[PDB]
A and B are shown apart, each in its own frame.
Chain A
Amino acid sequence: DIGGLNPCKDSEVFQKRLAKTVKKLENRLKKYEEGTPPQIAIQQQITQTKQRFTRYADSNLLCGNDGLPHLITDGRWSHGSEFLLPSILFLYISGWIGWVGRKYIRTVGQTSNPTEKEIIIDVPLAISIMTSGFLWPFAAWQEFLSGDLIASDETITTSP
């Protein structure tokens, strides 16, 4: 399909990889005894390996000639769960972190001892700001509009 890849559900090398891993795990399982915790752990390993391979097969995942899932990150929504949705999730979380950090910096920057409140965090104010970051996309595009997001010329510059 895309880039010459093929779905992993029809990739023979993918099933060969699964079979080889299961065979190695079973051979390891053979050298232990009865329902002893080592055998239980190896059986859990086998079950998890089978579940992971089955989930990857039924996941709209494209496999190359090596039988490994390749990620299609050109931007198409068909393979949108590989990069685009995790990209949105990370952008949300990281914007949350950056927004709460910036808000805390600007909030304790207007107190008597701004530097003290950076090594000794005001946990009440920190908790107040941190749970308010869920609106960071909206807060950012409400502070940029008001001109409160960017400094203009009070920023310092070197000699040249």
Chain B
Amino acid sequence: KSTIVDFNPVETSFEKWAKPGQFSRTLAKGPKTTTWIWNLHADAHDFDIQTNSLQEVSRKIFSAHFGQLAVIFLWLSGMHFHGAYFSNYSAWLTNPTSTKPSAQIVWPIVGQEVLNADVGGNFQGIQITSGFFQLWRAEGITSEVELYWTAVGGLVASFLMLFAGWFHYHKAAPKLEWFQNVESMLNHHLAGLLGLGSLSWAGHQIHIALPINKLLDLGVSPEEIPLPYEFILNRDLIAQLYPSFNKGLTPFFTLNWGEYSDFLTFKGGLNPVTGGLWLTDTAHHHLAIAVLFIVAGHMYKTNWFLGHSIKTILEAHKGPFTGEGHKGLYEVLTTSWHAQLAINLALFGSLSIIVAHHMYAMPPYPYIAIDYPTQLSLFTHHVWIGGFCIVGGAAHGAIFFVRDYNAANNYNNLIDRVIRHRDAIISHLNWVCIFLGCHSFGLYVHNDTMRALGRSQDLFSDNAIALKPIFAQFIQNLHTLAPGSTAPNALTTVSYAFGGDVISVGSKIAMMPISLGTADFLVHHIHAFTIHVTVLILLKGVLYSRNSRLIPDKANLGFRFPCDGPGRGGTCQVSAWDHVFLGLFWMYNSISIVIFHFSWKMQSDVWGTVSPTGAVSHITGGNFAQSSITINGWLRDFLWSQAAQVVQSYGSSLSAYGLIFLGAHFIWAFSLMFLFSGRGYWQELIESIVWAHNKLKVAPSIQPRALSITQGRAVGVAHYLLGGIGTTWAFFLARIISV
């Protein structure tokens, strides 16, 4: 009878596994039409409509989190197992600059063995662009046995998380008060999870990754490198590489932290041997992060007369312009899972995009900057994940507004005041979007039409009307001057992208000053415009989710509904879901432009080879500066030019990329059937098909119905995203692996 958990709440039985739709009150009666099948999967994780108790929803969410973490652990275990058994990691360790990482071999069936490429190191397989080899090298993993043991540990951890989910749904489910301890949860997630994870990783780096990687960079082969445990039992194997361990932990406890400058450095730049960040800098960074997060975890009052109450902090932040201020926000975020999901997903996607930027900007792994496929894939993948997560955060903000928003509890607070002037916000955001689009894109079109008319001096180019990004160049200058002036204890700039020397590893450029000209001005304003339009769609969905001048009772129709009818001139897509659908489209557009800008700019003005005398030759040859300012330039010098490797991949080991290119084109075009058409035509065609089936006595008892309007839109957008992202995926991968 614990005060935090309920014991044996749900019986572990297979009876409900044999009753599909048991969770829903409407679906439990059984299918009558094929719409029931689709409704079954669309409501599976909508725990809000399955129970009327916040406690049950919270417990379901907790167990679902455990299942998700078990799935993630299984995926990581699979990655490590493939590295251990079906990879050339050992060969890549001895030749990182000449062996391509491969960790998946393809069975010899139907002639598909051509996919096993010549990745080097007496190996055949698919080249890997996830950068696991570089990460494992940075971890100090020098043998495939360690990868096997990490895979075994991942399997054990996945089973543990599965057992934890089962235990906390069926044997000991926490109570609502336990879930609502946001102060305790924040304290623990900030100190324990974040800070202690940073501290543990700093310890691992210092004791395992720092010596092993230093020996690897010195040229010591992985076979004669001591086993990682020997660096702990023997204080002399690590004190030779870093002659500060001879003093032990006495400098730490005597506040003489200057003695540890051997392995806790602040250098900046990149390791000249590997092209990645100095691992001493990384260990010092993780140590500082650990201390900062542990300190930050002692902020909120949990169980003693010590710390802050988030309710008292929020309620004190009022103002003349904001009425009641943040009063009621604590109740909103402690009684609505959707609001928490909105905030967490938005910040999580933004964090993913920031991670993507800082990855290529400052390569943190050895021999990852010179693996161009890995860098391109990591950036594009993380930016895509960030965009999807941001759209999801907007969607769940809209869901909270529709479902969990209480008008009485939010009288004259920030949420109320935002809804009260939603018109002004949306109208000014509309004006900003029109201004930004007009300018950015019409400058592009003006360049295109001036070039087409033979007026080269009338373009918005560097040798013409020039739009120099002076503000960004000022920041670039400030960073390259930071070491010794504003960061006096730095030896080198944080990233060579801001300026400095060309860093090359094995005649391949790792990082180099990224010059910003009029071409970068236009593409940056294109980014701003696309982001603003996506924000416009999502914010219009969130703010007008409850009511509008069209439908004053839109909240009574729910978050997900197709329309209110053909009246009022037509009330299609007025939902808030139909705004997360359009916003998904515009996020695809924005992220596609972002990754295109990254790919072309890097290939044209960063990546390449360096001659022995210091001459820099890039992959494309600097065509970004003069040919990325017109739409015809993007079509020809980027799309047409770099699509050559994809279309000429047939018969080679990259033929799978051409096949996926074609299939993604097919899927993207397939999406337009659902996006352009309507439900009535398909229902009436199914009518004649059903007539034929009845004529042959083969009409199913479950009456076949065309997909609902909302499901038609969902299928269309899912296929559109899959096709477009897969086309860009195949194009990028084939292009950057070939060259």
Contact = CB atoms under 8 A, between A and B. Distances in A.
Contacts of B421: none
A109 B701 contact: yes
Interface size class of B (residues with CB under 8 A): 20 to 34
Given A38-B122, A105-B700, A120 B18 contact: yes
A36 to B, nearest CB: 6
Given A102-B698, A155-B695, A156-B691, A116 B30 contact: yes
A38 B702 CA distance: 53
Given A115-B702, A118-B701, A118-B702, A158 B118 contact: no
A150 to B, nearest CB: 6
B352 interface: no
Interface stretch (A4-12, A27-35, A70-78, A128-136): A27-35
A44 B124 contact: no
B113 interface: yes
Interface in A139-160: 148-151, 154-158
A149 B698 CA distance: 10
B678 interface: no
B691 A155 contact: yes
Nearest to B20: A119
Contacts of A156: 691, 694
Contacts, number: 67
A114 B699 CA distance: 12
A16 interface: no
Contact of A119 (B31, B124, B697, B699): B31
Contacts of B235: none
Nearest to B125: A38
Interface string B697-731: 11111100000000000000000000000000000
B272 to A, nearest CB: 31
A41 B30 contact: no
A45 B695 contact: no
A106 interface: yes
Nearest to A111: B701
Contact of A105 (B18, B113, B701): B701
A26 to B, nearest CB: 14
Contacts of A41: 108, 113, 116, 124
Contacts of A33: 122
Interface in A17-59: 28, 31-33, 36-38, 41, 44-45
A32 B122 contact: yes
B696 A45 contact: no
21 contacts: A32-B122, A36-B122, A38-B122, A41-B108, A41-B116, A45-B113, A101-B698, A102-B697, A102-B698, A109-B701, A115-B30, A116-B31, A118-B31, A118-B701, A119-B31, A120-B18, A120-B20, A148-B697, A150-B695, A150-B697, A155-B695
Given A38-B123, A149-B697, 18 more contacts: A37-B124, A38-B122, A38-B124, A41-B113, A44-B108, A45-B108, A101-B698, A102-B696, A108-B701, A114-B701, A116-B30, A117-B701, A119-B702, A151-B695, A151-B697, A155-B695, A156-B691, A157-B691
